[PDB]
Structure 1
Amino acid sequence: HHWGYGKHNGPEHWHKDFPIAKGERQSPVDIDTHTAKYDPSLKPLSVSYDQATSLRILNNGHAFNVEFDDSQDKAVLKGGPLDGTYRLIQFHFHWGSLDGQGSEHTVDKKKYAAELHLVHWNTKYGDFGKAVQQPDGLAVLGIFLKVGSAKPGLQKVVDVLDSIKTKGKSADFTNFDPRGLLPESLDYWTYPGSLTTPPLLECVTWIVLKEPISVSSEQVLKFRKLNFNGEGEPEELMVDNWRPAQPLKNRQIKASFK
């Protein structure tokens, strides 16, 4: 009886195995745009992905991860609210069964069709497993997806999903450039939070871009043909793999922009 996103094992159940689910800095949250304060002290955000080395794509039973070589400082996130250097390790998405839901963060209670998470870890902790034990261990760059025009830079991901339909399947996924997944603007909101899946560790600086990217109905339909289940098991479509907004508690969401 493992965690997941079903009636019997979904977000409302997680606290039983992972009591930090009811903690002081859980993610995601609703971003109240009228309450978030511009912070003139926020340094410029630096997304350096020119030397990114993608390796593999994995269906982990919850989402799919595009994994990167993080054995040296190739693709890094710096600046913004961050101190030091954060190495890209993987990206994944959360998405809905329909276009009116799927994002984890919400904007004035608005749900997007999906949300991309580019996950990075603080190199002062030496490895990802040590970083997740620290309050400043991870930086996740979150990008909203809306349904409209196709995102050309997403199509190589959409076209490999057939090959990783079920839990535990992977495929070679070299030479993928994550710069093709960014919006024009790097305006963002930031707040201290957590992993949005078990074990829900409170180790994440969240950086959520204001500008969504557009993907096509056909692109997000291919996400929804994935499976939570393993090969040969009854089909359970991989949809609605999102955690709802959590209480903000004693936190301020800061804006990079006026």
Structure 2
Amino acid sequence: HHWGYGKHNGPEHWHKDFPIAKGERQSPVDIDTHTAKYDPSLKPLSVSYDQATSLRILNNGHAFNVEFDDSQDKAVLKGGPLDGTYRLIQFHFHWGSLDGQGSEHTVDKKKYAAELHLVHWNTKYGDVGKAVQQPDGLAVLGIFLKVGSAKPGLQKVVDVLDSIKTKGKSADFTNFDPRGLLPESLDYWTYPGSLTTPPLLECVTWIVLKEPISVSSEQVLKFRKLNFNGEGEPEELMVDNWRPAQPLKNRQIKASFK
């Protein structure tokens, strides 16, 4: 019926309902570090999340989103390859059933345990709905998660997963600081792409950070205990909610570092 990540409604089937799946600037892609162009004109990212107002966390089937109040320029992203101000609307993760898979983007074919996506929308468009209809409507900050030492800033997220085990569940999630999920360095790669889930709109400027953050095995394990299904339905563990790398086509991956 609806799309998913299973054998019968997974990524290989999406093109039937969303023709854009075989488009020209689809994501994710493999970042070949030896062919990525170091661009001296790329400016440093400006991540201002000091006034971020998280509101709730919900399991929407597919993944879990932490939503933010984007009624005003509270948490924004500017700089880098971006033009204008982009407001943070939500963040979510993609992870695997095993530590050796989970990320959507790969670096030199290397997959990480998971990938964090901080989704922002261009303010010049007034609302997210309009922004998705534009080639530069969204900017997603992608951060790789590697299994190692626990990330303290991620623990609040992990503790609440129990209350949103199944599809449709949500819980109040206020006062969460997104800054706790950032690596030390903001060096990044960038390329024009798309949403990695249906509708797969090609409205995204991807900003993938070079430095991954580390999370403990216990932290990643809790992600894996979530359910794709809603209460009262057969249990399907929410794992491997990632889309395989797509062809780069006529695109150039630029790097903010040499």
What is the TM-score with the length of structure 1 in the denominator?
A: 1.00
Secondary structure of the corresponding residue to residue 230 of structure 2: coil
SS of 1:118's equivalent in the other structure is strand
Task: Map Cα deviations across residues 94-131 of structure 1 (whole Å, 9 max, x no partner).
Answer: 00000000000000000000000000000000000000
Q: Could you report, residue by residue, the CA deviation over 1:44-80 in whole angstroms, capped at 9, with x for unpaired residues? A: 1100000000000000001000000000000000000
Query: Deviation at 1:252?
Result: 0.1
* TM-superposed deviation, 1:43: 1.1
Q: Distance in 2 between matches of 1:221 and 1:162?
A: 12
Structure 1 residue 20 displacement after superposition: 0.4
Distance in 2, Cα, partners of 1:117 & 1:54? 15
- CA offsets 1:139-168 (integer angstroms, 9 cap, x no match): 000000000000000000000000000000
SS of 1:40 mapped into structure 2: coil
Cα separation, 1, equivalents of 2:250 and 2:8: 30
User: Secondary structure at the residue paired with 1:142?
Assistant: strand
SS at match of 1:192: strand
Paired position in structure 2 for 1:241: 241
> In structure 2, how many angstroms separate the alpha carbons of the residues matched to 1:37 and 1:249?
16
Kindly tell me the number of residue pairs found equivalent between the two proteins.
258
Q: Determine helix, strand or coil for the equivalent of 1:55.
A: strand
Distance 1:154 1:43 in 2: 28
Cα distance in 1 between the residues matched to 2:111 and 2:244: 10
What SS does the aligned partner of 1:15 have? helix
Q: In the aligned structure 1, how far is the partner of 2:203 from the partner of 2:19? A: 15
Long gaps (5+) in structure 2: none
How far apart, in 1, do the equivalents of 2:216 and 2:204 lie?
Answer: 30
Give SS of 1:70's match: coil
Query: Offset of 1:232 from its aligned partner?
Result: 1.0
State the identity as a percent: 100
Cα distance in 1 between the residues matched to 2:214 and 2:106: 16
Distance 1:88 1:230 in 2: 27
Q: Distance in 1 between matches of 2:5 and 2:183?
A: 29
Give, in whole Å, the separation in 2 of the partners of 1:215 and 1:13: 32
Correspondence for 2:89: 89
Residues of 2 paired with 1:52 and 1:38: CA distance? Answer: 32
What is the Cα deviation at residue 182 of structure 1?
0.2
Match of 2:143 in 1: 143
Aligned counterparts of 1:114 and 1:125: Cα–Cα separation in 2: 31
Deviations 1:199-253 (A, max 9, x none): 0000000000000000000000000000000001110000000000000000000
User: Quick one: distance in 1 between partners of 2:30 and 2:102?
Assistant: 14
Q: For residues 9-67 of structure 1, what are the alpha-carbon distances to aligned partners after superposition, in whole Å with 9 as ceiling and x for unaligned?
A: 00000000000000000000000000001000101110000000000000000100000
1:144-163 alignment, distance < 5 Å: 144-163=144-163
CA distance in 2 between counterparts of 1:146 and 1:82 reads: 27
Match of 1:102 in 2: 102
Q: Deviations over 1:159-212 (max 9, x none)?
A: 000000000000000000000000000000000000000000000000000000
Q: What does 1:18-57 correspond to in 2, within 5 Å?
A: 18-57=18-57
Q: 2: distance between equivalents of 1:97 and 1:132?
A: 31
Q: Any idea what SS the aligned residue of 1:56 has?
A: strand
Structure 1 stretches of 4+ moved >4 Å: none
For structure 1, list consecutive stretches of 5 or more residues without a partner in the other structure. Answer: none
